[PDB]
């Protein structure tokens, strides 16, 4: 299992961020895989899970952040874990984490995005 | 609401069973949809990486060669306790400890941080 994510991704104010993750495995994808994206802000020791991916259902969260933000934008098959972010704002300057888990391929470094919400 | 209870260090003498104690509450109930994530952060080190896995009733061992037939699933999900055991501890293990635990519908979590230092004394 290894998980490849944009070295950074830049979006104008108030419109829509595409965090594009894909892996690649030894293992089939299927009812086993899973995947969460973190949000690191920016300048700050801390990561939040926003949004969780298993059992071929999503479950969104409710961090005032990226609350009704959010949706699934990837497909196990093609081996595409990405999300939407709709709206961005300042607030959503910061580091996005990719984790992924296909068992039985549990050994993983985790994918970084630096994400600036920027003005055209 | 979830969040996640490890303790902030931990020492253990060369060579002894290491326990890394996790934790969490949550507001649902746990089940067939929760999942645990153990990951390992060596010494001065960016990186992070996984090597236990807990979900859908089973355990995932890795392969990775610092913890390959060191781990046990020592928590108990009716209990809320994600601890995993490993054996004998050696220098390589010096290192930041991070538990994850995902309890749907209850994702959004901080993962839990220890920094472990494997030592002779004490």
């Known amino acids: 299992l290894e998980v490849y994510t944009p070295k950074e991704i ?4 108030g ?3 595409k965090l594009t993750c894909k892996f690649k495995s030894t ?7 899973s995947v ?4 690191q802000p920016e300048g700050a020791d801390t990561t939040v899970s926003f949004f969780h991916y298993s059992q071929g259902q ?3 969260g409710n961090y005032p952040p990226f609350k ?7 497909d196990l098959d093609k081996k ?10 300042f607030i959503h300057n910061g580091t ?4 992924v888990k296909n068992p039985p391929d549990i050994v993983v470094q985790p994918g970084h995005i630096r994400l600036y919400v920027v003005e055209k």
């Open 15 to 17: 419109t829509q961020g």
């Open 68 to 74: 009704d933000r959010i949706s699934w934008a990837g």
């Open 58 to 60: 999503v479950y969104l």
């Open 27 to 33: 293992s089939t994808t299927g009812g086993l895989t």
């Open 96 to 99: 996005y984490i990719c984790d």
């Open 80 to 89: 595409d874990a990405s999300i939407n972010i709709e709206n961005m704002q």
């Open 36 to 39: 969460s994206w973190s949000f």
């Open 10 to 13: 830049f979006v104008a104010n």
